[PDB]
Each structure stands twice: as structure tokens, then as C-alpha cells.
């Protein structure tokens, strides 16, 4: 897993690309993605 | 003289508690500031 640098990245067959970063969003249990405004996957869990 | 530059004097003081006291005054500007926001804000949330 890379942070801070540009990757074209797979969470669970989300495919996308951007930089990764570790975030202070407070996900409940049952939740594996976020959303933007656009509906756009803005925040993901790593899934290990 | 002196009245007409006293009433004028007091006119502009009159301006300084209108704009302090009364944002609906700058509502024309305002509006186009609330426009193009809404139109960008609105361009965005069509991505979804």
C-alpha cells in the first residue's frame, strides 16, 4: 500500500487514480466507501 | 456653504451606518456572487 504519491490504485475492484492518503473520516462498521458531492468515491477503507 | 457641507458630511455618516447596520443593501452584487456559485455547485452535483 502506497500513501502520499500519485497511484492508479484497486480497492475490492474500486478501480480509480489519485494520491492515497490517511484521513480522519469517521466510518461506522458497515461502511466500505465515501462519497463526494459528485458521488465520486472520495474515501475508501483498505480492506486488510 | 457651511449647512451644504454640514448636510453632505452627514449624508456620508448616514451611508456608514446603512452599509454597517443593512447587508440587504449590497443584495445586487450579492445575488450574482450566489448565481455563479449555485450554477458551479449545481454543474457539479449533475456528475451523480
Known amino acids: 500500500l502506497v500513501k502520499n504519491k500519485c497511484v ?3 480497492f475490492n475492484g474500486l478501480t480509480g487514480t489519485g494520491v492515497l ?4 473520516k469517521k466510518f461506522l462498521p458497515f461502511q466500505q466507501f465515501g462519497r ?3 458521488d465520486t ?3 475508501v477503507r483498505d480492506p486488510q | 456653504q457651511k449647512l451644504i457641507a454640514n448636510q453632505f458630511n452627514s449624508a456620508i ?3 456608514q451606518d446603512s452599509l454597517s447596520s443593512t ?8 445575488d450574482v456572487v450566489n448565481q ?7 454543474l457539479v452535483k449533475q456528475l451523480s
Open chain 2, 23 to 30: 447587508a440587504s443593501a449590497l443584495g445586487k452584487l450579492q
Open chain 2, 13 to 15: 455618516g448616514k451611508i
Open chain 1, 21 to 24: 492518503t490517511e484521513s480522519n
Open chain 1, 36 to 38: 463526494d458531492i459528485a
Open chain 2, 36 to 42: 455563479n456559485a449555485q450554477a458551479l455547485n449545481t
Open chain 1, 8 to 10: 492508479n490504485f484497486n
Open chain 1, 41 to 43: 468515491t472520495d474515501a
